[PDB]
Design a protein around this nucleic acid. Structure first.
Ligand SMILES: [Cl-]
Ligand code: NA
Ligand code: NA
Length: 324
DNA sequence: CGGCATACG
DNA sequence: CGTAG
DNA sequence: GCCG
């Protein structure tokens, strides 16, 4: 088992779902306390189990696996012996975990804001609604649309959304293209992360594109709430009605498109691990715009995601195997 | 021990 | 501060 | 929390 998640295939569904979910509770709780190192370890340990070819049934089987030390091994041991890990269950039940999860789920609210509200004594969405002057415009929209945004959308909804975006993009700049990214590109059948990546085959033509796309979607009445990244809430048709959905639109020049496609396809852990691998193992600096050699002071050209994996000396993984 | 990804709005 | 993957 |  290689130590970096970008060195191994990770499918969307696997053989250790309950074990990984428990470790991810501890990772999430560590984030709510600002403990980013512990979050990463628990995320990495969970991801290792997603990559295994069969269920872990005995503690012996964790020997030698990267990111399994005393704490993560104890969690697994308790789940294997008793079906439940007391520490995980204590987290799940706690007022702190439940409230931090509720508040950070709001679009416009991060850990730092949620923690401050928690320390002020706030606990429910209606608590927040009773002091809207304490809210940014972004948080107001997140709160108003929270219920709809809490329900995932289906791939069929995604395909309907992509056609409306393509219509606006075609008027904004004929020849521009729209690519579905995020979790749907990794094979999800449902999810919240509806993301599109927009480019044009002629380098430079995409300059100024995103405002023109946004204006056209607004004129169509599709934008409930809203440069090169736009974080939107869209109206999605439903039988007899509609619902709010979070949609991100991103523009990249074609030269950068493989790097943006790679970054926006995820998973989050996969990208962090890829960037860590690049820098620490290869001495190259990776982001969603390019890959820099700091000794030559040159950027790699890439025409495909395959090029980027080759640059980094990694076997290619298709999107469906990037579910770290 | 230091490090933990790296951007944009 | 928030957002993204 | 774990790795190097
Ligand atoms: Cl930590
Ligand atoms: Na949030
Ligand atoms: Na998104």
């Amino acid at each position: 088992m290689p130590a970096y998640a970008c060195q191994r295939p990770t499918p969307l569904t696997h053989h250790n779902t309950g074990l990984s979910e428990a470790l991810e509770i501890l990772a999430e709780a560590a984030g709510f306390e600002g403990s980013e190192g512990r979050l990463l370890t628990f995320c990495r340990a969970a991801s290792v189990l997603k990559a295994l070819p069969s269920p872990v049934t005995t503690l012996s089987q964790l020997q030698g696996l990267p990111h399994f030390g005393e704490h993560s091994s104890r969690v697994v041991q308790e789940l294997l012996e008793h079906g439940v890990c007391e520490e995980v269950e204590r987290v799940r039940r706690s007022e702190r975990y439940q409230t931090m999860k509720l508040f950070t789920q709001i679009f416009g609210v991060g850990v730092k804001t949620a923690d401050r509200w928690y320390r002020e004594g706030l606990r429910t969405l209606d608590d927040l609604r009773e002091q809207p002057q304490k809210l940014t415009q972004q948080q107001k929209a997140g709160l108003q649309h929270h219920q709809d945004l809490s329900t995932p959308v289906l791939r069929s909804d995604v395909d309907a959304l992509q056609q409306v975006v393509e219509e606006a993009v075609g008027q904004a700049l004929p020849g521009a293209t729209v690519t579905l990214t995020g979790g749907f590109r990794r094979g999800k059948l449902q999810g919240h992360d509806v993301d599109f990546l927009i480019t044009h085959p002629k380098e430079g033509q995409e300059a100024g594109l995103l405002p023109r796309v946004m204006c056209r979607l607004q004129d169509q009445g599709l934008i409930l709430y809203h440069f090169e990244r736009s974080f939107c809430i869209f109206r999605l048709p439903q039988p007899g009605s509609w619902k709010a959905v979070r949609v991100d639109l991103v523009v990249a020049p074609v030269s950068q498109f493989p790097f943006a496609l790679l970054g926006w396809t995820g998973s989050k852990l996969f990208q962090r691990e890829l960037r860590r691998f690049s820098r620490k193992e290869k001495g190259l600096w990776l982001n969603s715009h390019g890959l820099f050699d700091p000794e030559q002071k040159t950027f790699f050209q890439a025409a495909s995601e395959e090029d980027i994996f080759r640059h980094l000396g990694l076997e290619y993984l298709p999107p469906e195997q990037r579910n770290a």
